Amino acid sequence: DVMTKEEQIFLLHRAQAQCEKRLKEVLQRPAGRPCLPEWDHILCWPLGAPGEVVAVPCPDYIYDFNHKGHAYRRCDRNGSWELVPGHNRTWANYSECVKFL
């Protein structure tokens, strides 16, 4: 019954392909400059309104995550995802997802 690493990787690949299709779709809508769907190797972040803190349920296809939790990004007021200054990284808080690992 155990989920193998190989299945977990397949599920990530499936979520990544869905994210790509999602980005292409929302790019055909009327829009200003919302923060756009992005794949980070764990999650597909959804559209974000300028300024807002974006909460996503810890993904159900990650077998070991806390599914009652959320992960967080922030969309800046220019429509760019918030960064970690001085590091080559987008700001994201996955603490709730990993609290029991």
Binding site: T4, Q8, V84, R89, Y94
Partner: peptide, 22 residues
């Protein structure tokens, strides 16, 4: 060990991912 293999892969994704405590 299949549980460990899977979890240790997740460790790398989180380390490379969770950045709010940097």
């Amino acid at each position: 060990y299949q549980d460990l293999r899977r979890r240790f892969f997740l460790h790398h994704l989180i380390a490379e991912x969770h950045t709010a405590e940097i």
